[model samples]
Target: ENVQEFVLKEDCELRFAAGDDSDVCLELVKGYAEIFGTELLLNKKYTFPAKSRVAAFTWKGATIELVGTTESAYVAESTPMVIYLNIHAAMEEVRKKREEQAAKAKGPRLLLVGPTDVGKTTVSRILCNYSVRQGRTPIFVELDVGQNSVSVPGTVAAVLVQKTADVIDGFERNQPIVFNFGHTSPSANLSLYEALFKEMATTLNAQIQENDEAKIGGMIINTCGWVDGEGYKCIVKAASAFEVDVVIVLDHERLYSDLSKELPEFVRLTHVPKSGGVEQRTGQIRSKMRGENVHRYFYGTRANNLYPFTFDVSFDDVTLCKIGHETKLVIMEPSADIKHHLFAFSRSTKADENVLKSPVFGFCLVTEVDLEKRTMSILCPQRTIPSKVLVFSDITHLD
Candidate 1:
């Protein structure tokens, strides 16, 4: 076997965060292909060796060496964060390969599930619209036997199949069609569910055998909102029987927390919010606190470890301060005129003297304060936020 070597055109400085930045480099190359007016497809398998702690790229097919101090510190820090990015890219690659291998298969199987009035039909409409935009005819399977909004009343026994041309005619495009399985009423029927599953499997199997390359990408199952407990349980059991991939739970807050624990194999949980003032429904729930409140929570609980203080800026403003690994002071409102307010608090006799000097501020509300040692543990939640606190460079008086 003979190997071909290519020359490096330009030095591409690739700075990696100590690990697995190869994908970033590959994406950068793909971007360059667009600029050069060429389409570049990556080889299915190719391994590149890292030069320094980082990797360097020159051109499309280039051999290069990177020079830098390989810090083990950055490597230790990055182990946890790299998995998410790698998995995302891997999934995309798998999907593309699967489609290619099953090009002549029937189609993709899609199952839609949600609570009532969460826009399942609207999503279907959008998907159908997208299919038309892409010039592909999609076969929509309306499996909602209950609340047959897409079809006329008492039409569960009649099956209506419309092509994309029929949909474009405007008489049937946005309307609800029916899949009749010899039933008089269109509600959630166990027989209908079983029939739909059988029909889809048979259709896809035949298509695959006939075309040899036919991919099953067109079948979709839209579920109904089961009102009763038995109905909901039945829906869950039916969905599990078919090995459903994605189960979208609408208005999931209404669902008990234990429901998630029941389905352990689900890959994702997407919560779609309702339109308009639906947020008002959860108004009674308290919103999580931010900034200074977080510091307060720590200080109030760890009184022996850290000191807490509250400062009043004039009669209107107040602020909170906590002394920990560093003197973290939080200002209520930095924009107010109460910048020179003083807050006095006592610290433990065994408190570290070095902590008084390591008063570095980074976050938006953080500041440094100098206070004399006092024994009392102060509990003043009202003094923080709206009140101001000023940090002194030098301690002068104890009041």
Candidate 2:
């Protein structure tokens, strides 16, 4: 095992990427350091999977160690961390004001907007981590369907950040509230996207009213990279729906200007440059990441492997349906085309289930579907199968 040590100066970053076939293990041996806002535990070895890119940053200088192979590793002299820190400090002040004074006034709702690979998710995570470290439980909402924050891709998810996110796995899963959108891009069904998002807002609002911490902590939304035409419309809709107060645009000056003009007078707008380490990803890489996300959901990660149970069941035992153009559930007969597709089990209360309003229980992969015998072999993350309706989607998994 090859071991390397680097001592970073103040406001410097050690940017590295794991080799395509090897995992990189990192540790903070001296001083303090953080990766995308989550501070590294001292002397704890964190293993980043193959093909993973990360930046271990320190504000007051620190010594760090790296083990295993890497595609590239270097120390960057400059970073946008100071600007990010300033924004966090301002947001934190508002949180304190809201907590001390207003039990009725709404808290700050911050939204991060940018193009693909501009570090939108990273910024969102940083803000959430800062809020949690300040003893506030902020809610994180992910509108990026292509790269999901929680659960699988092609879904909108939200979670309450009680602690700093994991350096390796992001947020720890504790039954994250999720809604299936059926496709990686919102363009697949714009109306359906809005419908799912509206339902998500309704659910979140209900929960926010019940919890004081969530109400005060507010929301930090991470949106998709699409900032033109229909994509732009979705961003406006999200802002209006969530009643967001602060907007941070990364590496998109035109977007910031457009949003500034379009948004209300009270809304705060800020534009920040994207990090130099942020690189544009090709379509092949995007597809690979999505595939890995699905694989991880079913099989977990290297440190925590999940055993998927594949079993045969009668077709009658499961109800197959798809969301129709009118947003109604359209029941379908089991067929060969359904094979190799992932289906989300709907958490419906009645026989006539409304798939659009329902949250997913979990997902199962259809490996084999027999029309004649009316049975199929499915792969699920757990043993028990849902007797409720399973919502079929265009999303499929090969392995």
lDDT for every model?
Answer: 0.33, 0.86
lDDT per residue, candidate 2, 1-399, as tens digits?
998899999899999999999989999999999999998889999999898899999989989999999999999998999888898888888877876786354568988898999988888888888888888888899888899878788888898889899888888776788888888889888998887777887898888888888888889999989999999989889988888888999999899989989999999999999999887899999888888888989898777779999888787777888876556668878889999888888888453656677888888889988788889988898888864588877788898
Query: In candidate 2, where is summed lDDT lowest over 10 consecutive residues?
Result: 98-107
The residue-level lDDT of candidate 2 at 347 comes to 85
Question: What is the per-residue lDDT of model 1 for residues 1-399, given as tens digits with 9 covering 90 to 100?
Answer: 222222233423232322323211223222221111112233221222222122223333333222222222111111111222232233334345666776343343345566656555444443443343334334454555433323312122111223322211111323232222222222334543454444444443454455432233343345665535555664455455544444445454544243456655653433444322112212122111212223432253221233445432232322333332223333332332222222322121222332232211111112323233211122233334321322221111111
The backbone clash count of each candidate, in order, is 23, 0
Distance from true location, Cα of 309 in model 1, Å: 86
Which sections of candidate 2 miss by over 4 Å?
Answer: 103-105, 351-353
Clashes of 2: 0
Q: Residue pairs in steric clash, candidate 2? A: none
